[PDB]
């Protein structure tokens with residue numbers, strides 16, 4: 001198991017615009033198109049991202065290109081961020097994958113504000129960190145996924161995905 005397989009399990013593959021937990025317009029393997037309620041606004045973003053008139057439908061390779069870009073942008077965002085980097089440096093390989101997962105899903109900024117959990121992860125307090133992560137809009141809104149990501153931080157194995 002590796003970060004790409006993990007994310008492909010968490011987000012799934014959809015070749016048509018759809019809405020995420022949060023009613024936000026998405027495509028492919030979790031690619032966020034926009035927060036506007038406008039679908040026309042989404043389709044516009046999509047064509048821009050793809051480079052062609054897509055009419056809201058993409059191919060599987062197109063989805064894969066977007067996913068590769070997004071995982072790359074998440075990792076780089078962690079490494080540049082003052083609050084996220086030291087946490088990442090302190091973690092083992094499985095836990096690192098889980099932090100990449102969070103950033104991909106909610107962005108740099110959003111993960112950066114989970115101040116208390118980040119400190120607990122840094123300090124290797126796994127059980128407390130799992131309890132704290134569960135008290136968030138994130139988990140209440142989208143519980144299944146949150147669950148897997150949280151277990152992953154809890155045990156340091158790929159069991160929730162196996």
Ligand SMILES: [Cl-]
Nearest residue numbers: 134135136137
């Ligand atoms: Cl809560």
